Enzyme design. Structure first.
Site, PDB file in Angstrom:
ATOM      1  N   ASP A   1      -0.604 -27.516  36.678  1.00  0.00           N
ATOM      2  CA  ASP A   1      -1.331 -26.563  35.844  1.00  0.00           C
ATOM      3  C   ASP A   1      -1.770 -27.226  34.546  1.00  0.00           C
ATOM      4  OD1 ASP A   1      -2.568 -24.136  35.656  1.00  0.00           O
ATOM      5  OD2 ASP A   1      -0.814 -23.033  34.933  1.00  0.00           O
TER       6      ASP A   1
ATOM      7  N   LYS B   1      -4.032 -27.909  31.768  1.00  0.00           N
ATOM      8  CA  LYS B   1      -5.164 -27.229  31.157  1.00  0.00           C
ATOM      9  C   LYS B   1      -4.955 -27.225  29.651  1.00  0.00           C
ATOM     10  CE  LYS B   1      -3.163 -22.607  31.841  1.00  0.00           C
ATOM     11  NZ  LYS B   1      -3.441 -21.230  32.335  1.00  0.00           N
TER      12      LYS B   1
END
Ligand SMILES: CC(C)(O)[C@H](F)CNC(=O)c1cnc(-c2ccc3cc(C#N)cnn23)cc1N[C@]12CC[C@](O)(CC1)CC2
Length: 284
Positions: free
Chosen positions: A142, A144
């Protein structure tokens, strides 16, 4: 190791989990995909607590486990630090005075825009953190700009390791933020090369100041802007963030070249994190 905090102690320091903004008198600084976060001074240590909020109650607790399990084995200056937890749901970390890279690229709550020199250091710091994770055979899954946090010195720190896995395999639960995810990850593949793809999206956000997805924007996906550049329709200077005055075209094009290599649709031709490090170090 970690401190087992008590529920009630967290309620008292959070003013009973006051979901109002700080400037209004509450404690909420932001919310994640799987929980909310508030500031709370504990033993003079300013702290961010993660009251999770579900995607069943079991899986949310197993991700609570995975974060603790990875955070116990992975300590690094470019990762967040888990101070402890409260289970009898809550994960306690050192408060990051400058929040997430996402919010600072959008100047949320009135923070000044990031300079090109800070953005270059943040990218190097973030790549340095991902390198430590991949060196320890861990995949974040993940990556980001909302999971790249910033301390008082704007030192980049990777956060949110609930989805992390040991280091190509397939899964039955495709998890992640779609605007950042590699095509193979969107289908259920687990590989460190997806982390490289998602870091390329963050590098595009850093260059442009544009969020990876904007519902009121055309194109809505920042990835769909790379293709508009690639097919010669425009150039990356047309998308350089205008909220900065210290950007030079040679370094901007160098970080874009890194992002383009990271964003190769075919995963095996994307560079590994060590090469991404070297290219970002050469840029400065
Ligand atoms: C003054 C300013 C400029 O307002 C500034 F911003 C104030 N400080 C914060 O806001 C802020 C501070 N420390 C954290 C922190 C620290 C460790 C962890 C771990 C995990 C996880 N796992 C999430 N957070 N975390 C997060 C923060 N804010 C978030 C806003 C949006 C998010 O999506 C949720 C929380 C990402 C970052």
């Amino acid at each position: 190791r970690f401190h087992s905090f008590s529920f009630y102690e967290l309620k008292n320091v959070t003013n009973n989990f006051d979901e109002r903004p700080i400037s209004v008198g509450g404690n909420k600084m932001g919310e994640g995909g799987f929980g909310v976060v508030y500031k709370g001074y504990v033993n003079n240590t300013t702290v961010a607590v993660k009251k999770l909020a579900a995607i069943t109650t079991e899986e949310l607790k197993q991700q609570f486990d995975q974060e603790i399990k990875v955070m116990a084995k992975c300590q690094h200056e470019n990762l967040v630090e888990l101070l402890g937890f409260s289970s009898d749901l809550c994960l306690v970390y050192v408060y990051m005075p400058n929040g997430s890279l996402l919010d600072r690229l959008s100047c949320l709550d009135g923070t000044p825009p990031l300079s090109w020199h800070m953005r270059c250091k943040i990218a190097q710091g973030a790549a340095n953190g991902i390198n430590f994770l991949h060196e320890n055979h861990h995949i974040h899954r993940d990556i980001k700009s909302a999971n790249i946090l910033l301390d008082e010195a704007f030192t980049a720190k990777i956060s949110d390791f609930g989805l992390a896995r040991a280091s190509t395999v397939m899964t039955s639960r495709i998890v992640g933020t779609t605007a950042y995810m590699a095509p193979e990850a969107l289908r259920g593949e687990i590989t460190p090369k997806s982390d490289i793809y998602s870091f390329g999206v963050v590098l595009l956000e850093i260059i442009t100041g544009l969020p990876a997805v904007d519902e009121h924007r055309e194109p809505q996906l920042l990835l769909d802007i790379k293709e508009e550049i690639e097919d010669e329709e425009k150039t990356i200077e047309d998308y350089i963030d205008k909220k900065m005055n210290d950007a030079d075209s040679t370094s901007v094009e160098a970080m874009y070249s890194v992002a383009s290599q990271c964003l190769h649709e075919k995963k095996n031709k994307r560079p590994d994190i060590k090469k991404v490090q070297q290219l970002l170090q050469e840029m400065t």
